[PDB]
Chain A
């Protein structure tokens, strides 16, 4: 998988593609179609991180994602495209509440 987490507005923001820069997040779409049939995306990257992740997890309200990669955790302020925060991991739990970790 890539690292992505989706806001229930309807944007799964992922980053990267497979090893592409993280530079590419977004997707609020704009339109509707049949179950079987297929759909269109928006285009407006944000990001161009360096650390290569393997986790994405949303904040409990989607909001703050903490992303880990290269073994450290960048958390983003997302809309912000701000680094919400960073450090090195080993293992994790968000305090589910959406306010601690």
Chain B
């Protein structure tokens, strides 16, 4: 900006004044500015289907902590989607969990996620992102973080 001084009493607004620039804050763009979180038009089918065309994967095996919760903090909250297919709920503890989760991404097509968190007693887990849009499968796996 070109920075101009004020008199608030009665001012002056004149062509001159000199610039300095100040660095502003980052904008990060989310996976929730774009999405409508949903319930499926056809989960059974869709669920699978989305796999069919779309599916990328990441696996981790969890050996120092046996808790979802960290993961959980990043996922419900980052994606802004619904955990489910009756596979959401956990009390202050729970043995196993799946979020098979929903919403639709911008540009029309959908971004779909299944997270099977598996507890043997370590957690090893299958995160699936399946999508009706290509950019989202790679994204979900990242974005969730």
Contacts and interface: CB of A to CB of B under 8 A. Distances in A.
A9 interface: yes
Q: What's the dominant secondary structure at chain B's contact region?
A: loop
Interface string B38-81: 00000000000000000000000000000000000000000000
A28 B18 contact: yes
A30 B18 CA distance: 8
A7 B23 CA distance: 13
Interface residues of A, number: 5
Interface range on chain B: under 10, 10 to 19, 20 to 34, or 35 or more?
under 10
A9 B20 contact: yes
B18 A61 contact: no
Contacts of A9: 20-21
B20 A28 contact: yes
Interface in A73-98: none
A56 B18 CA distance: 26
A32 B20 CA distance: 17
Nearest to A79: B22
7 contacts: A7-B20, A9-B20, A9-B21, A28-B18, A28-B20, A30-B18, A61-B23
Interface of B: 18, 20-21, 23
